[PDB]
Design a protein around this ligand. Structure first.
Ligand SMILES: COc1ccc([C@]2(C)CCSC(N)=N2)cc1
Ligand code: NA
Ligand code: NA
Length: 371
């Protein structure tokens, strides 16, 4: 409890391409880099010599492999994969000293899923069984871990925006945040669903029915890069951010993420950009808190040039890496809640820092939840 030095700095990544942890599967162990994803629930790994992959899971080499004689087909908005299901022994070298039998989807065919140039070979869905493929009876990795060990039912993520960070399995490390942790209830155990109750751009409420903030859901997701907002909320938010920094101008498509923009090294005009504040439902009736992020978070370096790291959605609000890189995030599954605290590693300046502040009084927070 409280200190987990061995798991500190166990995540690596490429900006925009996610964060991965090193894992081992099978006996003797085969080492793989695995994408950490709080927005899905399958543990799936490449199992065939696709040209983009550095390595892949060779089942024939594992004496502890067991076939489930079951296929699974998984499409996305863009990507897709299919695989064969099985179980085998799994470890996290820079994690708790335990081994568990878990479900593994051996990816045998894929399309627009593996990234050419990326250093990961699979994906660890850390979300709940409800959203597992093909159905909720396929036990997700973290469930199996908790059932078979004395590892407490929680994990936390410190993503430092080339990129690095920490996944602390089964605990919290207090050296990874400053100030206090504030908690938001997980509304339902499927995705890590939460309720946003208010959005401010540089102090200014957007005066939207808060039900719009959560249409049709809001989630904390480490596998998505951007802050994603519902169309209606997105429109208002760009309108408000456009207005706050119309001191200078950029092409109209930049806000849609259809192009980039540049400045000279040493001094970028950070300060003409507004903070964004999300107010989250708190632990207590009529009590909320807020997290505030800097431009440093929603202006993502590309290569001194930056892309606009907020974009629209038809799936609800998605607090991707943009949000999460400002914060130490605790997925406290045991008490059905997500904790936020200001990250010890987050990218700030001499002027403003990311913030987690409360309590605030918000009435009718239940009305913001979409049914
Ligand atoms: C970078 O490759 C990825 C990342 C994430 C995902 C999924 C499984 C679906 C898209 S969004 C998400 N969090 N998880 C699928 C592929
Ligand atoms: Na247990
Ligand atoms: Na601390």
């Amino acid at each position: 409890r409280g200190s987990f030095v061995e798991m500190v700095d166990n995540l690596r990544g490429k900006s925009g391409q996610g964060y991965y942890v090193e894992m081992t599967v099978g006996s003797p162990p085969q080492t793989l880099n695995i994408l950490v994803d709080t927005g899905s629930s399958n543990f799936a790994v490449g199992a065939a010599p696709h040209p983009f992959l550095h390595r892949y899971y060779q089942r024939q080499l594992s004496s502890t492999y067991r076939d489930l004689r079951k296929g699974v087909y998984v499409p996305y908005t863009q990507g897709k994969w299919e695989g064969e299901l099985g179980t085998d022994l799994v470890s996290i070298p820079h994690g708790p000293n335990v081994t568990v039998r878990a479900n593994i989807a051996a990816i045998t065919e894929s399309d627009k899923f593996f990234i050419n140039g990326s250093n990961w070979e699979g994906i660890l869905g850390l979300a709940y069984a409800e959203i597992a493929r093909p159905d909720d009876s396929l036990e997700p990795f973290f469930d199996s871990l908790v059932k078979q060990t004395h590892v407490p039912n929680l994990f936390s993520l410190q993503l430092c925006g080339s990129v690095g960070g920490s996944m602390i399995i089964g605990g919290i490390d207090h050296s990874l945040y400053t100030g206090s942790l504030w908690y938001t209830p997980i509304r339902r155990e499927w995705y890590y669903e939460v309720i946003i109750v208010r959005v401010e751009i540089n102090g200014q409420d957007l005066k939207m029915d808060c039900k719009e903030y959560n249409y049709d859901k809001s989630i904390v997701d480490s596998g998505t890069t951007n802050l994603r907002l519902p169309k209606k909320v997105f429109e208002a938010a760009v309108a408000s951010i456009k207005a706050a920094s119309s001191t200078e101008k950029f092409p109209d498509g930049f806000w849609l993420g259809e192009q980039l923009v540049c400045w000279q090294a040493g001094t970028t005009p950070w300060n003409i950009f507004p903070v964004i504040s999300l107010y989250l439902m708190g632990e207590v009736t009529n009590q909320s808190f807020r997290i505030t992020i800097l431009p440093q978070q929603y202006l993502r370096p590309v290569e001194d040039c930056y892309k606009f790291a907020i974009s629209q959605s038809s799936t609800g609000t998605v607090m991707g890496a943009v949000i999460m890189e400002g914060f130490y995030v605790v997925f406290d599954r045991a008490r059905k809640r997500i904790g936020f605290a200001v990250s010890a590693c987050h990218v700030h300046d001499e002027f403003r820092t990311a913030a987690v502040e409360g309590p605030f009084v918000t009435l009718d927070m239940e009305d913001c939840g979409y049914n």
